[PDB]
Design a protein around this ligand. Structure first.
Ligand SMILES: [Cl-]
Lengths: 167, 182
């Protein structure tokens, strides 16, 4: 009577969601045992496939974007998986990264309004301002990406690494 | 009558010029001198004017420069040699922090400027931020890739590698390293 939508499957990208152009990425939709049909779809085109796995040998700009997948067991469809945001990097010239609590500034030229900073393994910092301030000054290697909120999935090449070292 | 005081010889914005970038040399002695003479030691060739403009820095333009001025018929001592350096001539080295002794070390910090060209000269430096802070640049030169900075100041560091055979042709600057002394 109240048999609602089956539990959402998982949708991940291997080895990662941040995919530089021409590099490989595998999108895998995973549901519990008993799936009769899988369906992976790219939200921008409303074009889906019946296979759980979408392999992209060489990442292209047109393959960047939002993806969701669902599955059917019996005559029941599941909830959609969380949206996988497939990002393409190297779409633009890399920005520059420069300097208890430290503040770094990601400087770009294209006039983008978005930035992403991350400490290699991990920690991400997304901001709509070229000046980010890491709270816990944790020694490590940093890099940032710059992009436009108009195409939030097409990212520049990573900046040269800035090695943070606290004594 | 004896010789006149030596003039200054300065490059701007810097004596370290990345290839393709501009640099202007300026000779400057007391007010009112008659003639200026600016030379490059490699060709011993000169020009009788105080300013030399280089729209785009070239490898062959790197090297030592010197200048003197003539007032009346008297010459001045020669200016100090200006070492015009071309950076970005080689692949940038990689700068990393090295392990320090577990016991006290007096602020000492050891950095490694690693390249593979087989170079034998390294120039390490802490960038100097502008005002309202005005922090001076601090240069460190070594004949080997591993350099210990005594009582190191917090700051952004970068290094260059080069050969003693062509001391004025430096590599491109390494990626930055932000040292936070504690
Ligand atoms: Cl999209």
């Amino acid at each position: 009577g109240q048999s609602g939508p089956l539990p959402k499957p998982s949708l991940q990208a291997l080895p990662s969601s941040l995919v530089p152009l021409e590099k490989p990425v595998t999108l895998r939709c995973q549901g519990p045992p008993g799936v009769d049909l899988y369906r992976l779809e790219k939200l921008s085109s409303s074009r889906y496939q019946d296979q759980a796995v979408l392999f992209i040998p060489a990442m292209k700009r047109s393959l960047a974007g939002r993806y969701r997948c669902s599955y059917q067991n019996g005559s029941l469809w599941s909830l959609p998986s969380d949206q996988l945001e497939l990002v393409a990097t190297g779409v633009f010239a890399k920005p520059s990264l420069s300097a208890g609590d430290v503040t770094l500034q990601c400087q770009t030229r294209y006039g983008f309004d978005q930035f992403a900073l991350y400490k290699e393994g991990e920690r991400w910092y997304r901001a709509s301002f070229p000046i980010i301030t890491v709270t816990a000054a944790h020694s490590g290697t940093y890099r940032c990406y710059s992009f436009s909120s108009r195409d939030p999935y097409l990212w520049s090449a990573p900046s040269d690494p800035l090695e943070l070292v606290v004594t």
